[PDB]
Design a protein around this ligand. Structure first.
Ligand SMILES: Cc1cc2nc3c(=O)[nH]c(=O)nc-3n(C[C@H](O)[C@H](O)[C@H](O)COP(=O)(O)OP(=O)(O)OC[C@H]3O[C@@H](n4cnc5c(N)ncnc54)[C@H](O)[C@@H]3O)c2cc1C
Ligand SMILES: Cc1cc2nc3c(=O)[nH]c(=O)nc-3n(C[C@H](O)[C@H](O)[C@H](O)COP(=O)(O)OP(=O)(O)OC[C@H]3O[C@@H](n4cnc5c(N)ncnc54)[C@H](O)[C@@H]3O)c2cc1C
Ligand SMILES: Cc1cc2nc3c(=O)[nH]c(=O)nc-3n(C[C@H](O)[C@H](O)[C@H](O)COP(=O)(O)OP(=O)(O)OC[C@H]3O[C@@H](n4cnc5c(N)ncnc54)[C@H](O)[C@@H]3O)c2cc1C
Ligand SMILES: COC(=O)c1ccccc1CS(=O)(=O)NC(=O)Nc1nc(OC)cc(OC)n1
Ligand SMILES: COC(=O)c1ccccc1CS(=O)(=O)NC(=O)Nc1nc(OC)cc(OC)n1
Ligand SMILES: C/C(NCc1cnc(C)nc1N)=C(/S)CCOP(=O)([O-])OP(=O)([O-])O
Ligand SMILES: C/C(NCc1cnc(C)nc1N)=C(/S)CCOP(=O)([O-])OP(=O)([O-])O
Ligand SMILES: [K+]
Ligand SMILES: [K+]
Ligand SMILES: [Mg+2]
Ligand SMILES: [Mg+2]
Lengths: 597, 597, 217
């Protein structure tokens, strides 16, 4: 009994217990912001040398920083904020983390238990508000249960599909002192025959396939061996590989078997290949509606193969909720994709050549490059060209390169035109798609990986959302590299307004600050590229900098991201770039807007 | 039947119907930000000349702007945002509006009804998330019900205790076209014997009182005749008047009967008077826990009088939920306080003099001024002095003057040291207490009242939260006046850390940008006051400006807001300013921090 | 089981999916999960409560279901009533907590309670609420409830002493002059020794006995 109970926390405040549990969970970084209700915890962590504390300018900043940290490091991102508005300000980052499967542990101060439900000063019902944007949450009601709840939070955040959790900390609980012993288990952190048979059946199906394709996503990144086993499978059975936006970097795009990204703005070669494949191996991807195109018209050849007993969809998925949610799996392989790949690959036959399939694959790649209208004499820099320049120069350094983005056209062009080669190097808001993510995510990733080059490829409207966090990067010592693609428009929305609303640009042009004076005011280096002849040397200065730096690039306006699978269309029913079409579109836009755009 | 149905909307899209209903509800301003799911509504309002559209840099900005607009104008603040993160970004302003009783009508785009519940692109469960921070919300499910739901929203937002509502607008609903007639009532906007007897009993109680006091709050501001009837009552029955933070401006503070603000940081004269009053007339105030002090020790003399049948608490309250919630009312007068005052006052006896009560009142006012340590040769400007300077110079213009604030010490000093004389001139986050409120609220108030001087008295940490909205003020043509009290600290938190945590300043010093370069980058005039000899002329330049302007003032650091009723103490158990005590505290802080603070 | 039986006891539900109850445990589990299981603040409140009762000239015990939740509850209730010479009324749910045959029994109070019990609580200067929640079948019109105890509280010579285990039910309906948080039986063990022994209350019990005589059922 004495062996099962622990007295070592007796005499500590809840805040002190919190501090000790952070250490036991190997937390090396906390992102947060103080306030009245969370003071007992801030007093306990005062001058701690046990972890780095990162102070944002806004709690949304703390949230997205913790996300960037978690995606760069594979560890949970820990957030510590006060009650009321400190807590409600973390709602967008929590919903973001939930949609993108990001392990976030949010600790929010709360008014004393005696004031809850009285419309108290700085009281929000954050447990109610965050229910739908967390995997789980709880309000701690006494200090004796605080260690158990902290263990529970970290365990839930990091198991199954990773995601956000919230633990609410009333001020009287964190100020109270533990007076009683607690179970010692609470003071420390931590293949079915059914699945084994599904794996065997899956292998037998793949061994019949004549047109296989791997559709790989974020889940493969959640194990360090993931990308290795993906390559091992693709190499053994000779299978072309496409990834989602969130799977970018899971497979070496330089490899001949790389089909690049699929989906709404993915390669027409990848989209064509998945529409014609007789066997689809879905590895840690959830068939999102930006990827599938028209669901009823998705993967016709794999559905036919399944019906004829010679292919189908093999779905390696850790969360049962996402199995058979969108598309019917021919075989569902439940659990960690990397673990299940270790069992799968040895049952898979080695294949030397697939001459007709790869003849088709190579023909599609050749006819469907990411084409766009190149610069002409006197024109502005094209945003596609800028991305290529950054990608080509960044790979010259002897350092890891991590990219974060905002949301919009710049995000899609970054996805398309960067060459992705390493896991956890694309850190982008995909499911919720939060403008403003890019800068704080970069700071969080830079803190996780202090020897990495971290580049925030950002849109001007996105950057405007959270640009106050530039001060935070300086104060944290995070030498991030922000590149603002300044088209002076919410380009992704003007793209839709051009295509579907006859060039009626309804409130999609926000005015920008002077980004060079802004950088100066924030004590950040500033570079501005305004013409084609400054692109190369300006990008070099940007990447050579050893301090935080903001690069502004003036780029062409009103240019669409192509290819594009419009809403309602099948994945292989895409719009492609055409020079003459673009020219006509420009003329039509000019006429319709009286020359304003 | 034809007389009761209406066909006039047949053939319009949901977006077009939205637009027409804004007009029918006399909306003259919409605050919002575009995105994919709300495009059909943005297309319908394209180039509308029916209202002004205000574009922020962040949807939180739109939310707080709409709040500032509503509090300045008495009209609901209308917000229009997209799905997913556009919607979750309005959660803090909704919780803010709920706590402070602000009529907000939030319209959020949503993914098509066919995608709801599928973890769709940019899908949040905003109806679930916002349930607890709205009076009411709804998801519109077909276009035929869109006019009814819009009417419902405006009606709920503006009746009872005003507050926020949310209406969720799926993209397929707002793109769909009305094909059927709808009830014509849905296409147009819009004293019990029990209460009458309570009013009579209330008058009889007041007519017995020998030490009455009026405790007036935000509710009195919700009717244009409110302040007039408050004055009429105070004048007739010869009653001293104290207000909450949110009631500031309900009563002319220049009047001899003014006791100023009560509460945690209110006047010790007001706090003493309410602790000794035999009759408390609570007019549109909710007995918040920043006001009452220790509840069991609150208003002892009024409780005694009630028990002896010669006084008590007379609570004029519109929301039954807030009657007898905190303190027992001797008489509850349910409904609009202004309407019920019209019945009340004629039953109230006219009183010429109250010599002993006003002898006490005048003695308390004399001994309890808002004292503080004045400037000395070479010292920094004191923040209390700055506020007095602004208040004195602002009243020289022939214009209305509206003040918004951030949250913290600067907010309390603004409340204490301004002289409040007019209704709806103090626009401040009180119940939720949201840092970052000040700048966007000012923009919203300036749009509501374009001929007013609007001054955001802001803290440096608060201002950092949302400073990107400076661009928004320029783009909106709102010549707001921002005064940043730069103490380089989260002063309200360092005040608590000094007093209760032995000068352990745990993460309460955020680094600031260069505010003058920041202003320049945002195309805003900048003024910096760094010493005592620049205060007068700098404040004059600030107020004389006819364009948006940011004033930075360097002020004394580590100075507490006094008086202060510490948590747990009775309202009349306050800390007062003492020169020697302040000196000792400075010496102790210097010793404990090794001279750092 | 722990939640059901601690604090204010109440119902809990555990939902058991068929595939979980048919599945077989394949992994070890923490051994703690395979086995079942006075603050200075409250101590000071108890002392203040005793000082208030020691001033009372018209005390009454209002006892409810909470006193039944400890086997020693009724014993300590009797010990208190006997020591300080206090009449006892109970709720419907407290029936049987006190021997109704005892001369100090006022019977049940409330909507259909004895008019003697109802009269006594309306005239008492000190009300000792033991494990009872001031339900709306018991209090009658809340604003008119316990006028003499409210007056005594304001004059610093009585009031309501509420022994309650669930903070949610403290100051929910009526303001407690002293709130004594936790198990009523445990807190009575501390309380009674601080309470002065009283031999007679001639005028109060003269009123009590007159009310019982004129208000039978
Ligand atoms: C403007 C914009 C345009 C976009 N267009 C595209 C586009 O064209 N193409 C595109 O791909 N995306 C696009 N997106 C992003 C898209 O919305 C989704 O975010 C993304 O496709 C999801 O990719 P994913 O399935 O790999 O990742 P996730 O959403 O994180 O899903 C991962 C899946 O793997 C599972 N999983 C997690 N861990 C494991 C494990 N250890 N083992 C097994 N399974 C696991 C998860 O439970 C989940 O089901 C766009 C986003 C924006 C903002
Ligand atoms: C750092 C900080 C310190 C603070 N310290 C203080 C302080 O010292 N003193 C202080 O006063 N505040 C202080 N506050 C603010 C405090 O938290 C509350 O916000 C404020 O006191 C509420 O004032 P109120 O009751 O008048 O307004 P509200 O909270 O809006 O309540 C108004 C009440 O009137 C009712 N009502 C509304 N309309 C009508 C109507 N037409 N007729 C009748 N009734 C109506 C409402 O239903 C409600 O019950 C502080 C805030 C901060 C951030
Ligand atoms: C037709 C009808 C008529 C009724 N009329 C009457 C009437 O006239 N008179 C009457 O009395 N009732 C009447 N009732 C019943 C009434 O509605 C309530 O059910 C009852 O009065 C509650 O009694 P109680 O407070 O003792 O019990 P409970 O409702 O169980 O409350 C017990 C309280 O003690 C607390 N408590 C529990 N355990 C402990 C502990 N260990 N230590 C300290 N505190 C503890 C609880 O948290 C709770 O606050 C009537 C019911 C019906 C159906
Ligand atoms: C955050 O509010 C609470 O924690 C709270 C709410 C309701 C009831 C009781 C409390 C605890 S408290 O009264 O002691 N206030 C407190 O802890 N912090 C506190 N901090 C300030 O700035 C740091 C300013 C301030 O009131 C202006 N209150
Ligand atoms: C906002 O998402 C939706 O409205 C949605 C979500 C799930 C299923 C269907 C829809 C409607 S949609 O597929 O037609 N997309 C849409 O309306 N807007 C849209 N806007 C973009 O930028 C303006 C970019 C973009 O995908 C990258 N989608
Ligand atoms: C308004 C909007 N989307 C809706 C929206 C609104 N609000 C938020 C917080 N997030 C999103 N995604 C976009 S993508 C425009 C982004 O503009 P940008 O940051 O300048 O990027 P770009 O011009 O490259 O498309
Ligand atoms: C951190 C904090 N309060 C907790 C907090 C945290 N986060 C938010 C969004 N709001 C609040 N109210 C305060 S009041 C400090 C404010 O500092 P300031 O804006 O520089 O003002 P001042 O120094 O005058 O007190
Ligand atoms: K690429
Ligand atoms: K004043
Ligand atoms: Mg842009
Ligand atoms: Mg400050």
């Amino acid at each position: 009994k004495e062996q099962l109970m622990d007295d070592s926390f007796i005499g500590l405040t809840g805040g002190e217990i919190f501090h000790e549990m952070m250490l036991r969970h190997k937390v090396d970084t906390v992102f947060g912001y103080a306030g009245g209700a969370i003071l007992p915890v801030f007093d306990a962590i005062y001058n701690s040398d046990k972890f780095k504390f990162v102070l944002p300018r806004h709690e949304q900043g703390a949230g997205h920083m913790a996300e960037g940290y978690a995606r760069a490091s594979g560890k949970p991102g820990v957030v510590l904020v006060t009650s009321g508005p400190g807590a409600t300000n973390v709602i967008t980052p929590m919903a973001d983390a939930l949609m993108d499967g990001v392990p976030l542990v949010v600790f929010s101060g709360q008014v004393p238990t005696t004031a809850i439900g009285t419309d108290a000063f700085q009281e929000a019902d954050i447990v109610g508000i965050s229910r739908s944007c967390t995997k789980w949450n709880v309000m701690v009601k006494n200090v004796a249960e605080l260690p158990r709840r902290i263990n529970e939070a970290f365990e839930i955040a990091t198991t199954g599909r990773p995601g956000p959790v919230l633990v609410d900390l009333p001020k009287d609980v964190t100020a109270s002192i533990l007076r009683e012993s607690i179970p010692i288990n609470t003071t420390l952190p931590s293949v079915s025959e059914f699945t084994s048979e599904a794996i065997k059946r899956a292998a037998n199906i793949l061994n019949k396939a004549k047109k296989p394709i791997i559709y790989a996503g974020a889940g493969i990144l959640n194990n360090e061996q993931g990308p290795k086993l993906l390559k091992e499978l693709a190499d053994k059975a000779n299978i072309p590989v496409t990834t989602t936006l969130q799977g970018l970097g899971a497979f070496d795009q330089r490899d001949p078997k790389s089909l690049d990204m699929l989906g709404m703005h993915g390669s027409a070669a990848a989209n064509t290949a998945i529409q014609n494949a007789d066997c689809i191996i879905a590895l840690g991807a959830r068939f999102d509606d930006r990827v599938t195109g028209n669901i009823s018209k998705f993967a016709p050849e794999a559905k036919l193969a399944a019906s004829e007993g010679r292919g189908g969809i093999l779905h390696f998925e850790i969360s049962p909720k996402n199995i058979n949610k969108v598309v019917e799996a021919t075989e569902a392989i439940e659990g960690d994709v990397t673990a299940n790949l270790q069992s799968f690959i040895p049952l898979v036959d080695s294949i030397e050549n697939r001459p007709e399939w790869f003849n088709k694959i190579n023909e599609w790649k050749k006819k469907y490059p990411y084409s766009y209208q190149l610069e002409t004499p006197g024109s502005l820099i094209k945003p596609q060209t800028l991305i290529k320049e950054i990608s080509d120069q960044a790979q010259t350094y002897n350092k890891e390169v991590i990219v974060t983005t905002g949301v919009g056209q710049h995000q899609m062009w970054a996805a398309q035109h960067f060459t992705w080669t390493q896991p956890r190097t694309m850190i982008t808001s995909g499911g919720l798609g939060t403008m403003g993510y890019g800068l704080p995510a970069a700071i969080g990733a830079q803190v996780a990986k202090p020897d990495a080059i971290v580049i925030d490829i950002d849109g001007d409207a996105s950057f405007n959302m959270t640009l106050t966090e530039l001060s935070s990067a300086v104060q944290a010592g995070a030498p991030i590299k922000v590149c603002v693609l300044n088209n002076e428009e919410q380009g992704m929305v003007t793209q839709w307004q051009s295509l579907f609303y006859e060039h009626r640009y309804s409130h999609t042009h926000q005015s920008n600050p002077d980004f060079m004076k802004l950088a100066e005011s924030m004590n950040v280096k500033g570079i501005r590229i305004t013409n084609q002849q400054e692109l190369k040397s300006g990008v070099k200065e940007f990447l050579d900098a050893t301090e935080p730096v903001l690069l502004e690039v003036i780029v062409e306006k009103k240019v669409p991201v192509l290819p594009m699978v419009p809403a309602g269309k099948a994945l292989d029913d895409f719009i492609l770039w055409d020079a003459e079409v673009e020219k006509q579109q420009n003329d039509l836009r000019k006429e319709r807007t009286g020359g304003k755009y």
